[PDB]
Amino acid sequence: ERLLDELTLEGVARYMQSERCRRVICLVGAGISTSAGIPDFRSPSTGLYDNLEKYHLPYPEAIFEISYFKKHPEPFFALAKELYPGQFKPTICHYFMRLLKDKGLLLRCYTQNIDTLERIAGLEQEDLVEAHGTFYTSHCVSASCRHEYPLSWMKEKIFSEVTPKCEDCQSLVKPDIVFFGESLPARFFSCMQSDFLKVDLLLVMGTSLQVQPFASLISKAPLSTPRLLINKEKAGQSDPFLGGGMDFDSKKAYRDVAWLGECDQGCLALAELLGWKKELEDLVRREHASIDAQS
Numbered sequence: 601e602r603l604l605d606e607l608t609l610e611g612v613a614r615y616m617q618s619e620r621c622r623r624v625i626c627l628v629g630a631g632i633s634t635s636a637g638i639p640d641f642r643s644p645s646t647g648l649y650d651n652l653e654k655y656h657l658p659y660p661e662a663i664f665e666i667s668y669f670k671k672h673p674e675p676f677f678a679l680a681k682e683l684y685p686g687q688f689k690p691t692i693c694h695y696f697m698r699l700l701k702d703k704g705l706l707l708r709c710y711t712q713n714i715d716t717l718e719r720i721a722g723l724e725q726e727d728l729v730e731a732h733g734t735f736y737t738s739h740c741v742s743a744s745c746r747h748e749y750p751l752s753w754m755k756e757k758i759f760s761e762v763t764p765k766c767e768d769c770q771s772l773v774k775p776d777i778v779f780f781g782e783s784l785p786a787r788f789f790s791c792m793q794s795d796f797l798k799v800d801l802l803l804v805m806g807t808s809l810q811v812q813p814f815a816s817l818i819s820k821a822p823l824s825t826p827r828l829l830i831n832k833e834k835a836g837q838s839d840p841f842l843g844g845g846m847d848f849d850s851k852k853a854y855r856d857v858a859w860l861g862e863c864d865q866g867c868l869a870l871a872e873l874l875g876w877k878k879e880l881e882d883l884v885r886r887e888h889a890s891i892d893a894q895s
């Protein structure tokens with residue numbers, strides 16, 4: 601009746617190595633980068649919204665909003681200095697996605713994260729839909745210029761506490777983040793339209809599937825497509841209040857599996873089942889060593 605022979609990680613692994621599973625879409629959120637030292641600035645425990653008094657804001661969310669930013673970019677860039685990572689070292693989860701790419705299984709990774717770790721882990725622009733944008737590149741805001749600047753340039757400006765201005769036209773330069781008040785990139789909708797005709801497996805890692813329209817991606821899968829959640833908490837189920845949600849646990853469940861724990865440990869377990877654990881270990885050890893050894 602169903603593509604998975606059982607609703608377990610082992611069933612998913614068996615399906616993945618069957619001839620029926622050729623194209624995997626990953627949907628990822630902040631949970632895949634916390635072990636890298638990047639806080640989930642949507643979890644209250646990080647306390648982002650609490651410390652934001654030194655920036656003297658009209659309301660807390662204005663520092664994440666596009667119009668305020670264009671009028672007053674200094675608070676955003678001071679906060680960006682405060683929150684700048686000490687290192688950019690992707691996680692076992694990120695490299696698991698790189699292994700998917702290497703094995704010819706990765707159709708697309710849709711990410712909510714702006715932290716660039718997918719790119720550092722070796723996913724290419726074509727592999728990625730950065731649904732909420734990214735720090736990886738920045739652009740002059742003037743429509744007639746749009747000069748692109750890499751993260752190293754932006755970092756130099758942020759740490760020297762100089763507001764980044766375009767070298768060609770002296771306009772403000774903004775990281776390619778989707779600020780509040782901007783629309784998600786057109787790439788998100790056009791890729792969605794094409795990719796979900798083609799997907800054999802949805803791997804949902806490190807996201808509670810609460811932010812829209814990203815969360816709605818799980819309902820774009822074909823009805824037969826298995827969907828594996830690797831996350832500290834079960835998520836994406838139909839909300840009993842607000843009227844294609846995940847069904848892990850009912851008598852009617854047939855394709856959705858929940859593996860509850862840290863994303864790294866779930867990806868290690870899945871890799872072990874697939875026979876990839878040594879490959880993943882070697883890839884992570886050498887990439888981490890190269891990052892640690894940046895001189």
Ligand SMILES: O=C(NCc1ccccn1)c1cccc(Cl)c1
Nearest residue numbers: 641676679680683684685715735
């Ligand atoms: O996610 C953030 N900062 C970490 C980071 C990641 C990659 C590159 C630079 N910074 C971040 C979130 C909200 C507001 C600001 Cl201002 C920064």
Ligand SMILES: O=C(NCc1ccccn1)c1cccc(Cl)c1
Nearest residue numbers: 664732777778779780781812813
């Ligand atoms: O989450 C979003 N953007 C990321 C972000 C990070 C730091 C500062 C501002 N925005 C976002 C924006 C607009 C609509 C939606 Cl649905 C999400």
Ligand SMILES: [Zn+2]
Nearest residue numbers: 740745766769
């Ligand atoms: Zn410019």
